[PDB]
């Protein structure tokens, strides 16, 4: 417990410093202590790895965009592909690290439906990030693993979770994105987003009072996506 308190302190310092690799390192060590994470620690871990993977994804998107624009006969084509692959390798290592944290510690020790939803959504997210860069049959395998995790999180949360709660809203947001971006089914993505938004508004009076800000902001992301997707 002595080291755990130190690890959280350093995690929070690294976050304000925006040193997310340090932050993720500390939270990974906390997770490997084996104990169920509090809500604060769970969010700390999620923020840390979201920033760590997110820098690799934004770089991957840039490099891949340049490659798509490059003639197939260009000298530098192989250099560009080489560089994309280097970043993919970093990306796959980060996803693999989170996924093994999720399956050996977080999903295993969850004793309540909320933690189950949180961690299975996270499983869905990181398999989706793997699907973003996969090809061939492991694309199909990562896609199926991401969808399966999202669907189970979705079934649990529809049964156990208040529909306006940020966890439920974030799951529907990210699942809708998975339908839009990974399955390329824009109509089903709109309906998933719209249905979640509508049920959240309908159950507004049972929204947890300390979630008002987050629920308002995630509902808006759903509406923003809907507006974009139903324009062009």
């Amino acid at each position: 417990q002595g080291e755990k308190t130190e690890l959280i302190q350093k995690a929070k310092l690294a976050e304000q410093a925006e040193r997310y690799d340090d932050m993720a390192t500390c939270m990974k060590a906390v997770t490997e202590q084996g104990a169920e994470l509090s809500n604060e620690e769970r969010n700390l871990l999620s923020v840390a790895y979201k920033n760590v993977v997110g820098g690799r994804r934004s770089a991957w998107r840039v490099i891949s965009s340049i490659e798509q624009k490059t003639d197939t006969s260009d000298k530098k084509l192989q250099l560009i592909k080489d560089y994309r692959e280097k970043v993919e390798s970093e990306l796959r290592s980060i996803c693999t690290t989170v996924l093994e944290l999720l399956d050996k510690y977080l999903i295993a020790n969850a004793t309540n439906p909320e933690s189950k939803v949180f961690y299975l959504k996270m499983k869905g997210d990181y398999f989706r990030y793997l699907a973003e860069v996969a090809c061939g049959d492991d694309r199909k395998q990562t896609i199926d693993n991401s969808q399966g995790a999202y669907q189970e999180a979705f079934d649990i949360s529809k049964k156990e979770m208040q529909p306006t709660h940020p966890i439920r809203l974030g799951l529907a947001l990210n699942f809708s994105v998975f339908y839009y971006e990974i399955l390329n089914n824009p109509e089903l993505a709109c309906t998933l987003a719209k249905t979640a938004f509508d049920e959240a508004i309908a159950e507004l009076d049972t929204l947890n009072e300390d979630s008002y800000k987050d629920s308002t902001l995630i509902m808006q992301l759903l509406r923003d996506n809907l507006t974009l997707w139903t324009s062009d």
Partner: peptide, 8 residues
């Protein structure tokens, strides 16, 4: 411009 939860 599509946004996921990281947009928040």
């Amino acid at each position: 411009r599509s946004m996921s939860e990281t947009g928040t």
